[PDB]
């Protein structure tokens, strides 16, 4: 939750077959926890050989397409699946379902490290995108060159550099590279605001956002409600459901050096915004913040409003 000394625009990334499930109660764009884990993976595998510190991530999502279908008379939708290989006797496999989608996202990476003065900006940008072109972002492959990968160069920009006119000018020159984009932010305080509004009957927060991504048809003495924005339900972190265990206690863990607790994820709210409506760009970035003695592990955009 440090303030960023720079911003890094991974400019245009086609994602091949990402995970469009995101939670047990959503299905659209993937969870922003995947983006936080991606930028932390870049912090691991190249972010220490350049003496930098990559924390924030700004989601943009230019173009979206999911592999769904509505089944011919039904009003809801289903997912398109894949054939898995056959069983041991070659009979058939038990089908689990996974939603798959195609993203075209752009990433804004906050940089904090002391190596911003030791290295030229283009070398930092080139090595970051050349590493990120061999990784994956929501369980989905990050696609190489296509018919129109002309904005291939990454760009780096220090937000502190220059005068106030210079900072805001270079900001609005960055926003010309987010052209059909729609940034995703967290709007937790609006969830508590509407809960304090309609908390006459039931102050359960599940009912609140379960009555916000909707059209609310009120009747004659029809006055359907007005949408304040593109409010959509998001998953917003994890809450524990078990006492934490030692690194050797839990059977079949991913390793034997980290403690494991069984958790439950923790639903939230946020809404998609154009990159003109935001004031600056340092307020737009996602950060992971955990309270480990309790079970509150979450991510948000701190210092947005």
């Amino acid at each position: 939750v440090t303030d960023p000394e720079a911003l890094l625009l991974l400019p245009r990334l086609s994602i091949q077959n990402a995970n469009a499930i995101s939670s047990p109660l959503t299905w659209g764009f993937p969870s922003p926890g995947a983006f936080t884990g991606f930028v932390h993976a870049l912090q691991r595998r190249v972010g220490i050989s350049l003496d930098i510190e990559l924390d924030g991530v700004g989601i943009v999502c230019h173009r979206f397409e999911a592999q769904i279908s509505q089944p011919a008379g039904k009003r809801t939708k289903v997912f398109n699946l894949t054939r898995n290989p056959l069983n041991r006797d070659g009979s058939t496999a038990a089908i689990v379902e996974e939603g798959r989608a195609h993203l075209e996202v752009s990433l804004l990476l906050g940089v904090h490290g002391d190596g911003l003065d030791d290295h030229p900006a283009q070398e930092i940008a080139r090595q970051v995108q050349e590493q990120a072109g061999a990784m994956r972002l929501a369980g989905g492959s990050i696609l190489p060159w296509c018919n129109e990968r002309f904005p291939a160069p990454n760009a780096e920009l220090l937000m502190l550099g220059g005068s106030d006119e210079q900072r805001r000018k270079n900001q609005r020159r960055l926003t010309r590279r987010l052209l059909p984009g729609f940034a995703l932010v967290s709007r937790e305080a609006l969830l508590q605001q509407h809960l304090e509004t309609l908390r006459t009957t039931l102050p359960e927060a599940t009912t609140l956002d379960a009555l916000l991504d909707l059209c609310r048809i009120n009747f004659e003495p029809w006055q359907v409600r007005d949408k304040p924005g593109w409010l959509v339900p998001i998953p917003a972190g994890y809450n524990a459901l078990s006492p934490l265990y030692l690194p050797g206690e839990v059977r079949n863990a991913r390793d034997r050096e980290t403690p494991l607790r069984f958790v439950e994820n923790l639903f939230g709210l946020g809404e998609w915004l154009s990159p003109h409506r935001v004031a600056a760009l340092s307020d737009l970035l996602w950060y992971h913040h955990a309270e480990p003695d309790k079970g509150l592990y979450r991510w948000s955009t701190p210092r947005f409003v």
Partner: protein
């Protein structure tokens, strides 16, 4: 030493979806603004042509069952009626670092596994697996039914470093056979590029383009969605075809299935063709699993006896196991 209860390998040779677009042959050198192939819909009034269950075989039920026929909506992709060539273009990337698991419990098992893999790689390179991969790119396995009965297939591969073409190839997918992995100088050059990529030694990004002259207006075969829930048999669509944006395309998992077809070492016959590299190596079209665990050629058996118990297999089964580690997989107990 026991096995790791969690074993997971990430895939190398990660392909994309292959978009399909159409135009005329001998203008394929400038095939950059060719229009795409669009999925459309058409109607199908079918008829009853199934095997009956020897109890519903009376003439009255047959007549009364072809009174009310079978009416369907399918998806079809076709060439335009003045274009005879199918351009199928996708990008393959070769990652490298193929012995390192992506999730492993036991740190001793991972050390023994990486010693085993580096012992393989120093005793013999990735040359055999990359020349078999170079074959399955050099002919046109990824054109599945789009290859059958075409008269001229040309494959163009471009290695890409930056916004520029590092090296170009132009193969002939019908001279390069479908069965006998014959050697070639250009196949050896492209195979050395793939084997440099698979060993973590370079940045290998291919661009695979194949042209198939089939005929003006003929039918092409994009891949087909797996849909379980459909409507109430009246308005339902029995055949959906895959499409990324307004263009009929092939899934990436079956192009990767085409690249993986290497396995000429399963104990039935190499005369019946190479199959796809799988554990329990099984063919969905055949409906039958070759390489049973009741024999000893299964991937689990070979990997456990070559990592834990140091019963090193034959060299060909080593090629099979490293092909599985290149494939990926979520193994374990």
């Amino acid at each position: 030493l026991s096995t790791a209860s969690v074993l997971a390998f990430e895939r190398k040779l990660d392909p994309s979806d292959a978009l399909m677009s159409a135009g005329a042959w001998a203008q394929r050198d400038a095939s950059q603004e060719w229009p795409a192939v669009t999925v459309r819909e058409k109607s199908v009034r079918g008829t009853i042509s199934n095997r009956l269950k020897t109890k519903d075989r009376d003439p009255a039920k047959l007549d009364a069952s072809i009174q009310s026929p079978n009416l369907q909506t399918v998806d079809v992709a076709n060439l335009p009626s003045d274009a005879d060539t199918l351009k199928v273009r996708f990008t393959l990337r070769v990652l490298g670092g193929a012995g390192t698991p992506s999730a492993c419990n036991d740190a001793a098992y991972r050390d023994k596994l990486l010693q085993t893999v580096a012992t393989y790689v120093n005793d013999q390179g990735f040359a055999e697996l990359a020349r078999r991969y170079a074959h399955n790119l050099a002919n046109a396995r990824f054109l599945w039914r789009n290859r059958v009965g075409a008269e001229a297939v040309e494959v163009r591969i471009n290695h890409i470093r930056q916004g520029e073409v590092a090296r170009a190839w132009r193969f002939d997918a019908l001279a390069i056979g479908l069965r006998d992995f014959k050697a070639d100088a250009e196949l050896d050059a492209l195979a050395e590029l793939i084997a440099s990529g698979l060993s973590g030694s370079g940045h290998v990004l291919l661009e695979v383009v194949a042209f198939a002259r089939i005929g003006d207006g003929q039918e092409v075969f994009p891949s087909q969605e797996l849909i379980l829930d459909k409507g109430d048999k009246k308005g339902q669509k029995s055949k959906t075809l895959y499409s990324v944006r307004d263009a009929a395309a092939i899934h990436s998992q079956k192009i990767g299935n085409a690249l993986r077809t290497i396995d000429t070492w399963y104990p039935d016959e190499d005369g019946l063709g190479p199959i796809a590299v799988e554990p329990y190596g099984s063919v969905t079209s055949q409906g039958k699993a070759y390489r049973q665990p009741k024999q000893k050629l299964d991937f689990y058996t070979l990997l456990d006896n070559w990592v834990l118990r140091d019963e090193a297999p034959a060299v060909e089964q080593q090629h099979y196991v490293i092909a599985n580690l290149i494939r990926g997989g979520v193994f374990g107990e």
